[PDB]
Amino acid sequence: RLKKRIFAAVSEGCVEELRELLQDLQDLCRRRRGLDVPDFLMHKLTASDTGKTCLMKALLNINPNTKEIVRILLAFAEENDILDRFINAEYTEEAYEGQTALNIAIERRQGDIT
Amino acid sequence: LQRARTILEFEKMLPEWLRSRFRMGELCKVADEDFRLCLRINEVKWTEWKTHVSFLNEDPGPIR
């Protein structure tokens, strides 16, 4: 119920419901056993079937409010220190092997996000 | 126009259980609770560039 509401909020352009879900995501990190904070938080923001991440889902569905969703998502992944694995994630299945989040922003003709 | 008349004459002649086997198109979920049995045509366009909104599938490949 956490992973699906984040994908639904980013695609339609719900800015304010995104900040409430991301702050709840940090709350689950503290009150927990707390073993591996990079490998868990990367697993929640990634579909395990295809390897699609949240930043890939933002750029496929261009909203009028998508310039702020990229700004919040890149700000969020920095203090948790998984900036490297979040910006350089890839698909894993056979039909799309190697497509990155940079490779979608160029095709959707977004100059300033590039 | 002359060959199109010959095709529609052979289609009225064969029985019903052949006619369901030789049917074109497939059911496609177009909108909320709507199924319309569409036909698929591919094309390549070079001269007009735009950003793509209003599609059905995010994953552009052929499914399976």
Query: Which residues of A are less than 8 Å from B51 in CB distance?
Result: 62, 108-110
Tell which A residues from 38 to 77 touch B, by Cβ distance under 8 Å.
60-62
* A109:B53 CB<8 A: no
Bridge partners, residue A53, by sequence: A46
The whole-angstrom distance between residue A13's C-alpha and the CA centroid of its chain comes to: 14
User: Where does residue A36 fall: left (phi above 0), alpha (psi -120 to 50 degrees), or beta otherwise?
Assistant: beta
This structure was determined by cryo-EM
Least Cα separation, residue B27 to chain A (angstroms):
24
B34: DSSP letter = E
Bridge partners, residue B26, by sequence: B38
Interface residue A29 vs chain B (CB under 8 A) = no
Interface residue A108 vs chain B (CB under 8 A) = yes
Least Cα separation, residue A68 to chain B (angstroms):
18
CA angle A80, A18, A26 (to 5 degrees): 30
Tokens found for residue B45: 């366009």
SS3 label, residue A43:
helix
Which residues fall within 8 angstroms of residue A69, CB to CB, at 6 or more apart? A10, A13, A15, A18, A58, A63
In chain A, the largest separation of any two C-alpha atoms, in whole Å, equals 43
- Chain B residues whose C-beta sits inside 8 Å of any chain A C-beta: 49-53, 58-59, 61
Question: Could you tell me how many residues make up chain B?
Answer: 64
Least Cα separation, residue A109 to chain B (angstroms):
6
CB environment A89-107: b (16+ within 10 A), e (fewer): bebeeeeeeebebeebbee
Q: How many Cα atoms within 13 Å fall on the side-chain side of residue B22?
A: 9
A60 → closest Cβ in B49, B50, B58: B58
